[PDB]
Amino acid sequence: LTNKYYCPEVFLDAVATKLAQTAVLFLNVEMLNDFYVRFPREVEAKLHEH
């Protein structure tokens, strides 16, 4: 890894995997869980109003 400037491909892919995984954790809690909770309520309200 010490010649990172000679091998940009592998370096950029390592950065991409790391960012992807920690972003995946925060995403799963926040957006995914909030969707599982809010979605049915919104369905009920909007269907009733329609």
Partner: protein
């Protein structure tokens, strides 16, 4: 009263800050109403019954 009004106002703004902080750390700012609780629990029961 008018004299104490300013200091009381600033302190009220602060405790509004702290109540908001507890709302952030302990409930993750999830909005809640009685109707939302009832609907969610009813659907949990309906899934169990299914």
């Amino acid at each position: 009263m008018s004299s104490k009004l300013n200091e009381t106002t600033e302190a009220i703004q602060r405790e509004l800050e702290e109540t908001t902080y507890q709302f952030k750390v302990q409930y993750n700012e999830q909005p809640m109403s009685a109707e939302s609780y009832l609907a969610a629990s009813l659907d949990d029961f309906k899934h169990q019954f299914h």
